Structure 1
Amino acid sequence: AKLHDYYKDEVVKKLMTEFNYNSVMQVPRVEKITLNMGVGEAIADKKLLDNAAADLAAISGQKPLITKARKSVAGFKIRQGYPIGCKVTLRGERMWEFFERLITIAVPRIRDFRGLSAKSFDGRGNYSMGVREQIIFPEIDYDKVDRVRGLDITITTTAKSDEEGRALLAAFDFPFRK
């Protein structure tokens, strides 16, 4: 876990060190990233969705959930039981193993962050990546892939200010504004 080694050395080591500051138990942290994938509207096929969901779950500690709608009646041509996502939320070891291919080789499919002007306002450094499709994460059986499902992915820190997340997340090469 070569990235987790660096994350415990150089990352945020100098935070407040140009000020009257010595505290060791106050550094910002991450452990989890919020995840979701486009399941569509098909429920009676199953066999095409299940295959592509398993290819995403193969890099996560989770299995895809069935889910339900929050709003369905009088507005969307559905009722309460409608399956609306799958989660597959990424946490712990597989996050620092995902960050081991992120910015090192998982770069050539995502759209470069030009025109970005994004902010954070809750003291936890909440930021969404806006990548909109799954990035064909190149682990071992990814050459067969030329068709991709829609994706939603958003990170949050263990911190007191969004200014601490602004120091921590810069190690993953996210501009905040461009």
Structure 2
Amino acid sequence: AKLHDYYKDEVVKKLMTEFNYNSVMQVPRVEKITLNMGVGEAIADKKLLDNAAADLAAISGQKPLITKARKSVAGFKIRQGYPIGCKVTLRGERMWEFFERLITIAVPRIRDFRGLSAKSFDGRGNYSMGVREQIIFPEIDYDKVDRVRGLDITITTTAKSDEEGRALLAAFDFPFR
């Protein structure tokens, strides 16, 4: 958590002059980082989900939870209560360490990288990015994996507008294509 203490008196102090806040609790704070992995093809192989659950054990810092199907559709042959994905909702102490490792030594590992999209906001201030490889994280030994499908990082903040949550990530230099 190097950039956790950097948040306390170089990011909150910066945001008090960009949107003229009157209280110290009016600053947008980040709440959680959720790592979905939409495997999808677990109807054919059950161990494909177990290899997908092993990738989040190295990319994140803890064990994933498999996600059952909410509804049931026939266009993809899934039933009610079938594991079709896996998620890691990391927050608290280990999220400042994961956000440190992501934007510094994992975003420049993206093949054919130009910059992150600055319009990927949900109208509230919650950013969501999507990567297409596992090899952007150094924890994978490149020989145990057999699937191109990566994951998607969702950063949930406590902002209200898209511009208000844009200035929160802008302190971490967050390359902004």
Is this a same-fold pair by TM over 0.5? yes
CA contact (8 A) 1:61 1:91 kept: no
Sequence identity (%): 100
Instruction: Decide whether the 8 Å contact of 1:60 with 1:89 is kept in 2.
Output: no
Q: Work out whether residues 122 and 162 of structure 1, in 8 Å CA contact, stay in contact via their aligned partners in 2.
A: yes
Q: Distance in 1 between matches of 2:176 and 2:121?
A: 13
| Structure with higher helix content | 2
Q: How many equivalent pairs are there? A: 177
Q: 1:153 to 1:117 in 2, by over 3 A?
A: closer
CA distance in structure 1 between the partners assigned to 2:163 and 2:96 by the alignment: 22
Flag the 1:107–1:61 CA change in 2: closer, same or farther, 3 A: closer
Equivalent residue number for residue 40 of structure 2:
40
Q: Relative to 1, partners in 2 of residues 1:144 and 1:8: Cα closer, same or farther, differing over 3 Å?
A: farther
Aligned to 2:101: 101
C-alpha distance in 2, partners of 1:95/1:150?
Answer: 19
Task: Mark the structure with the bigger radius of gyration.
Answer: 1
Task: Tell me which residue corresponds to 1:152.
Answer: 152
- Determine the C-alpha separation between the residues in 1 that align with 2:144 and 2:121: 41
TM-score for the superposition, normalised by structure 2: 0.74
My pick for the range that moved more, 4-13 or 36-45, is: 36-45
Q: Which moved more, 1:79-88 or 1:69-78?
A: 69-78
Question: Which ranges of structure 2 fall in alignment gaps of 5 or more residues?
Answer: none
Q: Please, what is the CA RMSD of the aligned residues?
A: 3.4
Residues 69-108 of structure 1 show CA distances to partners (whole Å, capped at 9, x for unaligned) of: 2343343233223321111122111111112222332234
Q: TM-score, normalised by structure 1?
A: 0.74
Residue 34 of structure 1: CA displacement? 2.3
- CA separation in 2, counterparts of 1:164 and 1:140? 35
Distance 1:20 1:30 in 2: 19
- Could you tell me how far apart the structure 1 residues matched to 2:169 and 2:145 are? 29
